[PDB]
C-alpha cells in the first residue's frame, strides 16, 4: 500500500509545561504578548460566560499540573483563526489548573452553531485538548452546555457515542459566579464517569 512520511511521535508535556506555555503559572516573567485564557473582550458580541473545572485521575485525585487548549466559534458560529490580542474575540485560548485548588478558568462567550461536513448543525461546543505529565498523547474532548438540550439531542457528533450515559459526561452544568453565568466542566481521565475522548 502507499506509505507517507511518518508523523513525529508525541511525548508528554511534562510537569514543567508552564515555563513554556503558561509563564505566569511557572511563576516566571511573561513577555509582551501571551496566549492566555480571556478569549473575549467585554465588548465582544454574544453571551459572555465563565467556564471552570477540575481534572481527576483514575484514583479520583486532582491533576494539578494540567494544561488545556481551547478552540471555539464566536457567537455567529464563526471561527476566527487570525489570532490577535487587539481582537475583541479570539477563537483560541490556553488555560491551566492551579497547583493549589487545581481549577482552571476561561473567559469567553457561548459559541454559535456550526454544521458538520454533511451540512447538519452541531450543538454549540468548545473543543478541548488536555496535556500533562503522564499523558503521552494529548486528549481531545468537546464541551457542551446543559441549557442546549434540544440541540444536544440532535448533535451528529454526540449521537455517535454508542451509550447515552457517556454523552452526559460531555455536558457542562450551568451555574453562576459572582452573579455571572458560569458553567462547570470536570474532566475524569479514568474510571467512574470517565469522560469521552475523541479520535479524528
Amino acid at each position: 500500500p502507499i506509505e507517507l512520511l511518518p508523523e513525529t511521535p508525541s511525548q508528554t508535556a511534562g510537569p514543567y509545561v508552564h515555563i513554556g506555555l503558561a509563564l505566569e503559572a511557572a511563576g516566571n516573567p511573561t513577555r509582551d504578548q501571551e496566549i492566555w485564557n480571556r478569549l473575549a473582550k467585554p465588548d465582544a458580541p454574544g453571551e459572555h460566560i465563565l467556564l471552570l473545572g477540575q481534572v481527576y485521575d483514575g484514583n479520583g485525585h486532582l491533576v494539578r499540573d494540567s494544561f488545556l487548549e481551547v478552540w471555539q466559534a464566536d457567537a455567529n458560529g464563526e471561527y476566527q483563526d487570525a489570532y490577535n490580542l487587539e481582537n475583541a474575540f479570539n477563537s483560541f485560548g490556553r488555560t491551566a489548573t492551579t497547583f493549589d485548588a487545581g481549577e482552571w478558568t476561561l473567559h469567553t462567550v457561548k459559541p454559535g452553531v456550526v454544521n458538520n461536513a454533511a451540512g447538519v448543525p452541531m450543538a454549540p461546543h468548545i473543543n478541548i485538548s488536555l496535556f500533562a505529565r503522564g499523558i503521552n498523547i494529548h486528549l481531545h474532548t468537546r464541551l457542551y452546555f446543559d441549557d442546549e438540550a434540544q440541540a444536544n439531542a440532535k448533535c451528529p457528533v454526540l449521537n455517535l457515542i454508542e451509550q447515552p450515559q457517556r454523552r452526559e459526561t460531555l455536558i457542562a452544568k450551568r451555574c453562576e459566579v459572582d452573579g455571572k453565568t458560569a458553567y462547570r466542566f470536570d474532566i475524569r481521565i479514568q474510571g467512574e464517569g470517565e469522560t469521552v475522548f475523541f479520535d479524528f
Binding site: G58, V63, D81, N90, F92, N116, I135, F197, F200
Partner: peptide, 30 residues
C-alpha cells in the same frame, strides 16, 4: 504516572468537521 492518567475506555472516532480542520494562525502575534 501514565497508570492513573490514561483512559480505560476506547477513544470515540469522529468524522473531521470545521471544528477539527481549522486552527489558529499566529501570523499577527507580537
Amino acid at each position: 504516572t501514565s497508570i492513573a492518567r490514561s483512559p480505560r475506555q476506547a477513544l470515540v472516532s469522529i468524522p473531521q468537521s470545521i471544528s477539527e480542520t481549522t486552527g489558529p494562525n499566529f501570523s499577527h502575534l507580537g
